[PDB]
């Protein structure tokens, strides 16, 4: 019989993780401000990491890596990449991005401005890969779980968040063809259900249209980017030898261009899962991240590569 607390009510993901834990008979939920827990399911802002790991006789785990905001804020992500050697200013998989405080097309963000006139200003991918029939933009979302040992687990099911409008070079002000977010669209559901294409169909389209696979053309590059990004910050955030332990779920947003090159757009600290996949991922988070630390009575692909040089 272990114990946990819930300090994020919005969190649709850890709402299900909370539910799955309760429906076991070996995990009791306590009040939000009870100190005597094994697991904290914590708030987004101002999570009190200084109070963790100081309760005698309790092994404490939390579902956030302290200092992982340096990867999830856009401003810090750019500064991390330009300053780290492991991902340099000459980094091939990140768009050319700059920082000024509050083919020459750019994009500004933190209201989204796409022009040549006009926070972070980023090189806008003018010639992206376009799904047919449709001639339309997409972005890939992959869910990564880093456990207490810093095993990087890539969840095998991702999703393409698609645009439903034809992509237009000349027409920049119209946002529904350029920006491929789930909220902005809701042609909402013409080609695929809720502008969501899964990895089976997207592997099949590639075979048919492009004579290649997802595993080769795109997913190798994704795995290299996930591993590169997380191993870079490992020394700064890792909870090995620390008095409390951390895990976290991340969401990695990608873009594939016409020549099949994959670009990192944003890392997401408190990511929401796709409707279908909640059941499996939230069971996986329990199996790998929680039950390893607290044993009771694979859906992931582990990222590791020691090339000698």
């Amino acid at each position: 019989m272990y114990t946990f607390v819930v300090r994020d009510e919005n969190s649709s993901v850890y709402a299900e993780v909370s539910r799955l834990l309760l429906a076991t008979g070996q995990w009791k939920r306590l009040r939000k401000d009870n100190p005597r827990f094994n697991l904290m399911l914590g708030e987004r802002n101002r999570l009190p990491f200084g109070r963790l790991g100081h309760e005698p006789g309790l092994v404490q785990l939390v579902n956030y890596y302290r200092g992982a905001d340096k990867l999830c804020r856009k401003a810090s992500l750019v500064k991390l990449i330009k300053t780290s050697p492991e991902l340099s200013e000459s980094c091939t998989w990140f768009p050319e991005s700059y920082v000024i405080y509050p083919g020459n097309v750019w994009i500004a963000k933190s209201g989204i401005l796409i022009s040549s006139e006009a926070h972070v200003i980023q090189k806008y991918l003018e010639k992206p890969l376009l799904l047919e029939p449709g001639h339309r933009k997409f972005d890939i979302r992959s869910w990564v779980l880093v456990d207490h040992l810093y095993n990087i687990y890539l969840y095998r099911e991702g999703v393409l968040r698609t645009s439903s409008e034809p992509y237009n070079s000349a027409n920049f002000q119209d946002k529904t063809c350029h920006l491929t977010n789930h909220c902005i669209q809701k042609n909402y559901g013409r080609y695929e259900e809720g502008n969501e294409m899964f990895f089976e169909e997207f592997n099949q389209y590639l075979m048919d249209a492009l004579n290649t696979t997802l595993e080769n053309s795109i997913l190798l590059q994704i795995k290299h980017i996930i591993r590169s990004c997380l191993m870079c910050i490992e020394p700064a955030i890792s909870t090995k030898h620390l008095h409390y332990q951390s895990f976290q779920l991340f969401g990695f947003d990608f873009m594939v261009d016409e020549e099949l090159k994959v670009w990192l757009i944003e890392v997401n600290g408190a990511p929401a899962c796709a409707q279908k996949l909640y059941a499996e991922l939230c069971q996986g988070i329990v199996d790998v991240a929680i039950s390893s630390v607290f044993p009771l009575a694979s859906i992931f692909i582990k990222l590791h590569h020691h090339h000698h040089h």
Binding site: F49, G50, G53, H54, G67, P235, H241, H243
Partner: peptide, 11 residues
């Protein structure tokens, strides 16, 4: 941090 007189994270 395991050797510090007070447990905290200098990082």
């Amino acid at each position: 941090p395991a050797n510090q007189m007070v447990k905290c994270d200098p990082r």
